[PDB]
Amino acid sequence: VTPEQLATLSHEFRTPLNGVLGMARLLENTKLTAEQRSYVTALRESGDHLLSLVNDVLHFARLGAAAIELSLAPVDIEGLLRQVAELMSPRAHEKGIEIAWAVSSPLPTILADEGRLRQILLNFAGNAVKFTEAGGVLLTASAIDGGRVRFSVADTGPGVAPDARARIFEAFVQTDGAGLGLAIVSRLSAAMGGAVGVGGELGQGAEFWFEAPFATAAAPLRAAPLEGRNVAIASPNAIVRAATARQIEAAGGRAYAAVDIASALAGAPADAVLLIDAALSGPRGALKPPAGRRSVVLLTPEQRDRIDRLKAAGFSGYLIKPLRAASLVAQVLQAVEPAHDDRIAGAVASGARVLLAEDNPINALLARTLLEREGCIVDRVADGEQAIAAASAGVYDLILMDLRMPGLTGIEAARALRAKGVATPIAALTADRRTCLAAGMDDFLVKPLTQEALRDALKRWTT
Amino acid sequence: VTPEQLATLSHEFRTPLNGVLGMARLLENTKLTAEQRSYVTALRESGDHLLSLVNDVLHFARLGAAAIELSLAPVDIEGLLRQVAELMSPRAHEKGIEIAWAVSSPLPTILADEGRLRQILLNFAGNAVKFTEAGGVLLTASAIDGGRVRFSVADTGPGVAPDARARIFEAFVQTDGAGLGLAIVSRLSAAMGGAVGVGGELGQGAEFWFEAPFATAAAPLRAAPLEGRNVAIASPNAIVRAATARQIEAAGGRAYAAVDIASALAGAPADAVLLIDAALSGPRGALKPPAGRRSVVLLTPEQRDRIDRLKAAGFSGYLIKPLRAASLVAQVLQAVEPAHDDRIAGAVASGARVLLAEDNPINALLARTLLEREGCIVDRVADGEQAIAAASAGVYDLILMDLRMPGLTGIEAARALRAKGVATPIAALTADRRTCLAAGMDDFLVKPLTQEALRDALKRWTT
Ligand SMILES: Nc1ncnc2c1ncn2[C@@H]1O[C@H](COP(=O)(O)OP(=O)(O)NP(=O)(O)O)[C@@H](O)[C@H]1O
Ligand SMILES: Nc1ncnc2c1ncn2[C@@H]1O[C@H](COP(=O)(O)OP(=O)(O)NP(=O)(O)O)[C@@H](O)[C@H]1O
Ligand SMILES: [Mg+2]
Ligand SMILES: [Mg+2]
Structure with a gap:
């Protein structure tokens, strides 16, 4: 309707919704029972689901409510296809399909909004893994003329009827929860002065594509180290x-x-x-x-x-x-x-992506060292705010938060993210924890960090 | 956006939302603790609040999404002003203001939609009780020319700025949760070929008014039994x-x-x-x-x-x-x-309005007899469906449901109302109760009904 009107609409859905989840949290961190843990589980699930419908619907609404403003930066495309493929990898392997990416040539390093671009590819990729029962999914990108890049997500699914191919990029259009994932891609497309479309053939597969005029930052440096072989x-x-x-x-x-x-x-x-x-x-x-x-x-x-x-x-x-x-x-x-x-590498997991909030560079080093030794890919930030900056823009599986950090308190950094919508779990480090939970933090860890503590957390929040 | 699209949008917000509340229910009907009951309380509150934002927003949306179709019936207006005044009476008295209604002359018995008309007066009345700290609120109705009726809700509140008086009937316009209560009245107005407006004076009070062309069913029979006195x-x-x-x-x-x-x-x-x-x-x-x-x-x-x-x-x-x-x-x-x-009359309460679902007329009689003897105003319906019919259209404080009733099972009648949005508590009567709860029923009562059982329930769900 309006952006000012939506900013308080969000507050009012979210606030009581975080309320529910804060309560569900506290409850499960208290001795319970068969049934009496049966319930607190099945509640945190119904709550978590509803939160993702709410974020979806507010995301959608906030994209048709203003211009949108991109934070342009140099991104490695090969590195981006890989990150997405590796995030989807667990969904796909547990249905017994394959996810893979390739580029044909070296592409340039590009000036784009990493997070928003990723969001498009996740929307296409998720869809693809959800809808195929048979072969698998291929992420592709190739340079075209006009300084333009073109991304593909192909899938051996059941494909899209020829006339149904305009329909499906609209809001609340389905196959028969939100039905917004493509609507959201349609509006990130236009914001990058792009186009999006679909091909393939009914019953053979579907290709989902994005074609965006972009800025180049780099020569596609052309080192071919498998020449001959x-x-x-x-x-x-x-x-x-x-x-x-x-x-x-x-x-x-x-x-x-x-x-x-x-x-x-x-x-x-x-x-x-x-x-x-x-x-x-x-x-x-x-x-x-x-x-x-x-x-x-x-x-x-x-x-x-x-x-x-x-x-x-x-x-x-x-x-x-x-x-x-x-x-x-x-x-x-x-x-x-x-x-x-x-x-x-994991002692338990496959490679959890982890955000590390620690302001001491040398304590970060020692954490990073046990983290990467259980297969974690880790990003580090100094303070509690450029954490928020990088826990939206980012996509991660756990968040390790110092509390007595300058910039923002750990607790008001949690709160901030929980009220911003984002659902990723958050564990605090230090040497008065019941507020921690309800505030929106999921776990606690004894700082300094330890092999066996870190395993617990990796097994609990990554599966 | 669309009505078909909204009908499934509702299902998807509601389903996980009922999920939360079903779980909150079960939890509280199991031995808990200080904190461990502290939590299940504060959860059912955050959930109940969110459900009323969701019903509000879907109500609003479903009124701009189609024509609306009125179920016209003969209604007693004096009886309607009274019902609303008596529903608001507890809010007002606990802030130490007064709610009262009067008509000046006998009005006609009228052909209108009781429920939708009531919804307008509750929206105006609630607002009035919420916004006045000082005198109180007066519900008024008077016949005008054109077969037209005009309803007033006057309040000794802080009144409405002269230019702010168009603004406030729009969606998500506030004073600075939804801010929809008047938006919803604006659209029931137009559906009755009415108008709505506001008067008074800044800092003296506000009159909220509705003026609807209506059908007359009756001579306003003019018995004046206080002639002389x-x-x-x-x-x-x-x-x-x-x-x-x-x-x-x-x-x-x-x-x-x-x-x-x-x-x-x-x-x-x-x-x-x-x-x-x-x-x-x-x-x-x-x-x-x-x-x-x-x-x-x-x-x-x-x-x-x-x-x-x-x-x-x-x-x-x-x-x-x-x-x-x-x-x-x-x-x-x-x-x-x-x-x-x-x-x-109540042994505990003031007069709870109660809906009684019982198909045996003589068992209904004996229930009604203990009900009206604790000050309850009671409506009775034979089966589990014309209960749904009359638990939306109606406004009530408790619902007594038989289970082995023909038409619809008690359990699928609960479920039906819980999925339709309505929040009123529901107690079942009979001689396998854990599904009862999660299905959306709040309490159980041993049928046949009893003085002391009924008191428990009246004290638990009416305060
Ligand atoms: N790879 C695909 N193959 C076949 N159908 C697809 C594929 N991707 C998308 N669709 C169809 O496109 C529709 C719209 O997709 P989308 O907007 O992502 O909604 P959703 O995935 O159904 N709901 P949401 O989870 O919010 O994303 C889906 O309902 C499917 O009907
Ligand atoms: N009697 C009144 N006196 C003064 N201001 C009023 C009165 N009734 C309504 N208002 C104002 O009208 C605005 C819109 O009212 P309404 O649409 O009922 O929203 P709300 O009552 O604020 N939110 P909601 O609970 O969904 O009804 C309120 O925000 C107040 O600012
Ligand atoms: Mg999807
Ligand atoms: Mg109101």
Whole structure:
């Protein structure tokens, strides 16, 4: 209706809503029972769901209520596709589909709004993982003429009827909770002077696309460190074949993808290196590195504890899916040394993205050091406000908050984020905690931080 | 946006919201603790508040989303002003202001939508009780030419700035939760081919008015049973003087209102009957019926247990405020026998309005008989659906529901109302109750009903 009118509308939905969740919090941090914990669980779920409908609806409304103002910055696109693929990776693997990204050429470093751009790709990507039962999802980006970039999310789902393709970018249009995820993309599009559309074919799949005039910051520096070298993919999955190919050729390699351990060999150069999907495992997890060939197994993070058996069988190494082009390159260049992927490093988890609020650089260092040793990707900020700045703009799985930090108190920094809408869990560090909770903080940790404390938290808030 | 789109929007806000409240219910019907009951209380409050913002916002939206269709019926206007005054009576008396209604002449029985008309008067009345700190509120209605009726809600509040008087009937316009109560009245107005407006004067008060072309069903039959008789009002309150006057003259009496026990006497006929407000009580509740005069004390329901001392002092009787013109007339005609007002009948409460769902007419009779003996005004319906019909259209304080009733199961009748938005508490009667609660029922009662059970419920859900 108006922006002033909405700013207080939000306060009035949110305030009682945070009220509910603060209460649910406190309750569960008190001895309860069968049923009497049954209830406080099923309440925090109904509450959490409603909060995401409310943020969705207010997000939508605040985007048609003013101009919007972008905070333009240099972003690494390959790094962005990867972050999104890696956030979606858990949803996809638990339905038994694949998520992967590739670029065909090096693209430029770009001047865009990282957070808003990511929001578009998450909307397309989530949709894709929700709607496909069969192959998987491919994130793609390619430069076009006019200083323009074009992002693709392709999926082996059931596709979109030809005439239904205008409909679905409108508010509260569904398949038959909000039905706003695309409406929100339609309005971030126009704010970047972009367009968005959809293709594919009914019953084969859907491609969702975004095409935005952008500012370049950089020469797409063109280092091809796989010049010469040859690489075979054996995977029965279409997405791992397509993406893994393009990732090779982006590093200046030649790629032979095959459905089969036996086909790969059949049509690939003899000096070629063999990438083999563990989806080809026969009974007992039988996977034979074909006699007298350099071979790398492609595992999902869950398949991590197979890595020892498959190195004894004579695989020279492993890659984790979705494939990082950087770790891909490091492994092929063992046609002759790289660190263990952070996603199987965890003592429990896969790689939780973590925001660290600590103002002492050296205490941050020691926290970061135990964090990255349970596979966490960690961002650090000095004070309680440029935390808020970076806990909206950001996307993260946990938030570690100092309390006696200057700028803003830990407690009023929590409160601030909880009242701003964002739902990410928050653990406090220090050496009067019942207000902490109700204020909107989920856990407490004894500072200085410790291996075994940090594990508890990683297992509790990342699964 | 659309009505189809809104019908599922509502489902999606409501469903998780009922989820929260079902859970809050179950929790509180299990042994808890200091804090661990502290929490389940403060949750059911934050939830209940949010539900009323949601119903408000969906109500508003569903009124601009279609035509609306009125269910026209014969309504008694004097009976309607009274019902509203009596619903507002508790809010007003606990801030120490007065609510009263009068008509000047008998009006016709009218063909209107009772529920929607009431909703307008509640919106105006609530506002009035919320915004006045000083005198009180007067509900008024008078016939005009064109078959038109005009309703007034006047208040000794701080009034409305002359130019602010268009503004305030718009959505999300405030004083500086929703700010929708008048927006909703603006759209029920237009649906009755009415107009609505406001008058008064800054810092003296505000009159809120509704003027609707209507259908007449009846001759305003003109029985004046106080022809001849004279009546003096002594009250320091402006509203009780104004309303109490007009109520006399509507029955064809002559009225002399005075601020004072001593002024009344000073200028009233000697044969006149004296109505004296207990707000004139001096210390210890001293109130002298002036020697050798027929006098009736006007009490608020809380002042009920003073009725014995004041009959010994020589008052011939009492009226409860806000004054019922019917009980007024019955008392004056003791210039020479009426039942005890239902509002001080309660063993605990004042008069809870109660909806009774029972299909056996004779079991309804026995329930009604204990109900009306704790001051309840009771409506009865045969089955679980024309309950829904009459628990929206209606306004009530408790709902007594049979379970093994034909038409609709008690449980799916609850569920139906809880999903329709309405918040009124619901107690079930019979001889597997944990689903009852979560389904949206608040209490259980052993059928057949009993004095002491019914008291519990009246004290728990009416205060
Ligand atoms: N990859 C896809 N394949 C097929 N249908 C899709 C795909 N992505 C989106 N849709 C359809 O597009 C509609 C609108 O999508 P969207 O606005 O994201 O709503 P939602 O995902 O249904 N609800 P919300 O969770 O708020 O995002 C969905 O209801 C689907 O009907
Ligand atoms: N009797 C009154 N005296 C003075 N101001 C009033 C009165 N009634 C209404 N108002 C003003 O009118 C505004 C709009 O009223 P309304 O739409 O009822 O919103 P609300 O009462 O503020 N919020 P809501 O509870 O949804 O009704 C209020 O915010 C007050 O500013
Ligand atoms: Mg979606
Ligand atoms: Mg109001």
